[PDB]
Amino acid sequence: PTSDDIFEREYKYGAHNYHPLPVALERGKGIYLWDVEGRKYFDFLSSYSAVNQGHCHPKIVNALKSQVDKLTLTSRAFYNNVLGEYEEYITKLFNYHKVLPMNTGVEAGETACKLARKWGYTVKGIQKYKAKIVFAAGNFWGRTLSAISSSTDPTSYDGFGPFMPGFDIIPYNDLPALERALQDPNVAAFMVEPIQGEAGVVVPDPGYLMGVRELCTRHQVLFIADEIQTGLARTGRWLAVDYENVRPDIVLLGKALSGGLYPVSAVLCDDDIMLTIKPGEHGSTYGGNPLGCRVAIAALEVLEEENLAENADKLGIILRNELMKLPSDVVTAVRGKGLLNAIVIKETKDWDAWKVCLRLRDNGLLAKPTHGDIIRFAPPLVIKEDELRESIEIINKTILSF
Ligand SMILES: *Cc1c(COP(=O)(O)O)cnc(C)c1O
Structure with a gap:
C-alpha cells in the first residue's frame, strides 16, 4: 500500500468528483497526520474545521x-x-x-x-x-x-x-x-x-x-x-x-x-x-x-x-501577525479570525497556490488551495504555541523558497 497504489485504486474505482492533494493519509492524532510512508504532517486544514478538537x-x-x-x-x-x-x-x-x-x-x-x-x-x-x-x-x-x-x-x-x-x-x-x-x-x-x-x-x-x-x-x-x-x-x-x-x-x-x-x-x-x-x-x-x-x-x-475558543483567539492573533510579515512580493493579502485564516498570493506564470501547497506537503504541512491564489490555514484548535511557531517556520521556508 504505497501512495501511488492508493491514488491508482481511487482513480480506477472511485468517482472523479475531487482532485485531492497527492497525499495518502493513514493515521491521525491531535494536530498531526501520518501517511502510509510514515511521514509526519501538520494538519492546517482540519478537515474543513471538522476536527477542531484534534484527530481522534x-x-x-x-x-x-x-x-x-x-x-x-x-x-x-x-x-x-x-x-x-x-x-x-x-x-x-x-x-x-x-x-x-x-x-x-x-x-x-x-x-x-x-x-x-x-x-x-x-x-x-x-x-x-x-x-x-x-x-x-x-x-x-x-x-x-x-x-x-x-x-x-x-x-x-x-x-x-x-x-x-x-x-x-x-x-x-x-x-x-x-x-x-x-x-x-x-x-x-x-x-x-x-x-x-x-x-x-x-x-x-x-x-x-x-x-x-x-x-x-x-x-x-x-x-x-x-x-x-x-x-x-x-x-x-x-x-x-x-x-x-x-x-x-x-x-x-x-x-x-x-x-x-x-x-x-x-x-x-x-x-x-x-x-x-x-x-x-x-x-x-x-x-x-x-x-x-x-x-x-x-x-x-x-x-x-x-477553552479552545480563547486559545484560538490568542493563537490566531500570532498566526496573522506572523503571516503579515510575509513579503507583499508573494503574499498579496492575509485575512481571517481565530484559527480560520487565509493568505492570497500573487499568482504568476511561475507559480500558483497548488505548487505552494505541494511544497508545503514536501516540508511537512498540509494545506489546500480554494481559488488558485488563496491558501487556507486552519489547524486544530488544540495547537500549542510552539507547534504553531514551527508550522509558521515551515510556511515561511516554503514561501521564501520560490
Ligand atoms: C461545510 C459547509 C457546509 C456543508 O457541510 P456538509 O457536511 O459537507 O454537507 C454547509 N455550510 C458551510 C458554511 C460549510 O462550510
Missing part, C-alpha cells in the same frame, strides 16, 4: 466506543435514551428553545430553508410558494440541487439542470444591498455565513452582522446564520456572530459538532419557528441517532472544558 480526541473516541456497544440506531419511529439528553445540552449551551438534528451540513441548510418557507406561509402570511430566501454572493452550504441553486460558483451549478426557484442573491458584506432586497414583502429569510470560508475566508466589515440583524428584525425576516464551519470555537468564540453579540433567528451547526467521528448536524431555533414543522413533515433516518448524540456531547464537552 480520546474523550470523543471513548464516548463512541461506549455507546456503540449498547445502541446505535433505532430510527425516529421510537425513542432512544440519548437524544433528549443531547437536545437539552445543546439547547442550553446555545440558548435556543429547540434543536432539530440532522447528519450533514447540507441537510441542516435544507431544513433551515424548509423552516423559513413554512414560517413565511404559516406565521408571516406570505401567499403560498411566493416565499423568497436571500443569500450572499460567494455562499456555500453544500451540493444539493437547492444548495447549488443559490451558489454563485459556476462549477457548483453549471450543467446541473433547472434550479430551485425562490432564491435571490445579493453581494456579501453589503448592508444597503440587504436593505434594498428586504423591500420585497415575500422575503422569508436571509441566510448568511459570519465568515465565508469556502469563498476564501472573506471577513465582513465590523458591524455587518449587527446591521443584518437590525434589517431582518425591521422587515420581519428570519436571520439564518450558517456556523457549520465558523462555529464551535474556530473563530475565537462559540459562534463567530458572538463577536458582534448578535442573536440570529436560526443557527446551523455541523462538522466539528462531532470532532470528525460522526456525521452530525443541528438546526437551532426557538419555538415560534421550530413548531411550524408538524410531526411527519420533516426528518431523516440517521438524524438524532444515539451514537451521534453521544459523540456530539463528547465533542462539545471537550470544546467547553479545554
